[PDB]
């Protein structure tokens, strides 16, 4: 049957939640919703407990709740956010208005565990390796990130990593691309970014810290290059090409000079995700095969995830309709075993 449900005033409204969830404490909170940690009775879990801010009040934020839950549904791997549950008060479509998401509580994020320090080679290994694989599932999906920094890594006291779509020095993180508002993105975009990351592990020190848009810019042609020609004649912009030939070469960096000390295995790989031409890059399916994770890799247990429907992006419904969607997908939840 349906649980029993208690009512307690938190973070300025009333939630209404199941009784198994216990001990409700607010962490944060924003224009999104607030959050709850609680104990999950049930399953013995420490748990954040999240009530949706304004779900259905436009087709926007309708959309958005759709959008959310249909993506928190469908990712069911290790290293990604997944959910242990979703609920509402509501007893039927008609009383809908509160959505509330349940997942892991996290207590730390990536720049929690490295503090501008230096991680050996073989922690780094064991980092960059999980990002790679929650990113290979990702990334099947045909889904991006686009941007994947420190503060969207959760991490706990095992160095166990997952990757999320919040948080728990924006920029530095960013493909290039992305920066100059290409469109046309490469899933390799996101693979950029775990080349930065990875840098900055090893080094203790971020790759790309720029000031601003164009300083970001400048330090990133300063290590990999200004483009060549293969780059460029795949460029259809004519002011971001008379642009580009205008600027004085600059070679690409010795890598081995630039991360000396560091496994050369490590080196190669960074050479191959920071490659400004981001048909060049590294994806991640090829990253998890390349020797530097060879204490980790696993060919048949690095998952990819099942074909995901995202047709309604492009659909314009009614508000009733998106909140319609939506009821039906918290209905038909199933909690992972
Ligand atoms: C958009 C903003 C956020 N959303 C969630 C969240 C909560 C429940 C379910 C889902 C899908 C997301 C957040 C969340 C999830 C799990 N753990 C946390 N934990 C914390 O924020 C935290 C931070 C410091 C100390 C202790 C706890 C937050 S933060
Ligand atoms: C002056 C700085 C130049 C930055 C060049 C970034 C090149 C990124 O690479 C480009 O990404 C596009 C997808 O976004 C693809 O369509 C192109 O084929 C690919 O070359």
């Known amino acids: 049957e349906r649980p029993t449900f208690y009512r307690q005033e938190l973070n300025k409204t009333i939630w209404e939640v199941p009784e198994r969830y216990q001990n409700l404490s607010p962490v944060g909170s924003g224009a999104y919703g607030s959050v709850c940690a609680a104990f999950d009775t049930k399953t013995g879990l420490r748990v954040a407990v999240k009530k949706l801010s304004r779900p259905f009040q436009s087709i926007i934020h309708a959309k958005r709740t759709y959008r959310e839950l249909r993506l928190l549904k469908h990712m069911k791997h290790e290293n990604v956010i997944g ?12 009383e809908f208005n509160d959505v509330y998401l ?11 565990i490295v503090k501008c ?4 080679d073989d922690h780094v290994q064991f980092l960059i390796y999980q990002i790679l694989r929650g990113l290979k599932y990702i990334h099947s999906a045909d889904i991006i990130h ?31 691309e992305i920066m100059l508002n290409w469109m046309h993105y490469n899933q390799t975009v996101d693979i950029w970014s775990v080349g930065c990351i990875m840098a900055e592990l090893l080094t203790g020190r971020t790759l790309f810290p720029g000031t601003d848009h164009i300083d970001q810019l400048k330090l990133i042609l300063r290590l990999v290059g200004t483009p060549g020609a293969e780059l460029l004649k795949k460029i259809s912009s004519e002011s971001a090409r008379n642009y580009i030939q205008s600027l004085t070469q600059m070679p690409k960096m010795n890598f081995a000079n630039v991360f000396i000390g560091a496994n050369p295995l490590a080196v190669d790989l960074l050479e191959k995700m920071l490659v400004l031409d981001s048909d060049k890059r590294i994806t991640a399916a090829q990253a998890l095969a390349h020797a530097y994770f060879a204490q980790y890799h696993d060919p048949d247990d690095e998952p990819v995830a099942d074909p995901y429907d995202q047709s309604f992006e492009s659909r314009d419904l009614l508000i009733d309709e998106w909140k319609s969607l939506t009821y039906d997908e918290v209905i038909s939840f199933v909690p992972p075993p």
């Open 146 to 176: 686009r941007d994947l920094k420190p503060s969207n890594l959760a991490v706990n006291e095992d160095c166990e990593l997952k990757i999320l779509d919040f948080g728990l020095a924006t920029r530095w993180y960013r493909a290039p």
């Open 117 to 120: 320090q230096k991680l050996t």
């Open 102 to 112: 349940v997942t892991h509580l996290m207590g730390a994020d990536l720049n929690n």
């Open 83 to 94: 959910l242990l549950d979703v609920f509402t008060p509501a007893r039927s479509l008609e």
